[PDB]
């Protein structure tokens, strides 16, 4: 159980961080060019910022004609970065608030937030969602990954 838990998430987190290595900085900003990102990445790209606690943007509604806030303009601006992936990988999993995980709780099981599904519409972005769902797994195992105690897992 002890080694079965850590070894169950280890390959999950490492599989994500390594996904960004093969990726490129220009491959990310490519999303900032088009009018708007896909319906599949719209959630993933957000799962990266939400984990940090980024605020939305400010713009005028084109359909309402009033002052409103757009969390998209603030999100896409994160993809235009060339080192946007260097930050998520440099983030400390020991500082992951339950407020950011509770927002993607129902998504962790959603078929539109999995690394296997995102690999169909977003092979590159797939490396992101994989880290979001992995970081939550590695943090759940760390609770007993290497307790180094007795009277347990011992025959």
Q: What are phi and psi of 25, to 5 degrees?
A: -70, -35
Domain count within the chain: 1
Pair 63, 102: CB distance under 8 Å: no
- The experimental technique used to determine this model is NMR
Could you tell me which residues are beta bridge partners of residue 12? none
Note down the domain range covering 69.
1-155
């Amino acid at each position: 159980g002890s080694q079965a838990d850590l070894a169950e998430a280890l390959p999950l987190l490492e599989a994500a961080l390594k996904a960004l290595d093969t990726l490129k900085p220009a491959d990310i900003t490519e999303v900032k060019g088009m009018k708007s990102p896909p319906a599949g990445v719209r959630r993933v790209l957000e799962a990266i910022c939400i984990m940090k606690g980024v605020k939305p943007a400010r713009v005028k509604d084109t359909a309402s004609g009033r002052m409103v806030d757009d969390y998209w303009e603030a999100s896409k601006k994160m993809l235009m970065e060339f080192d946007f992936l260097d930050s998520l990988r440099k983030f400390d999993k020991d500082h992951i608030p339950p407020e950011v995980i509770v927002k993607i709780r129902p998504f962790a099981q959603d078929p539109e937030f999995q690394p296997k599904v995102i690999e169909k519409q977003s092979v590159a972005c797939a490396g992101l969602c994989s880290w979001v769902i992995a970081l939550e797994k590695y943090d759940k195992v760390i609770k007993e990954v290497e307790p180094k105690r007795q009277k347990l897992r011992e025959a």
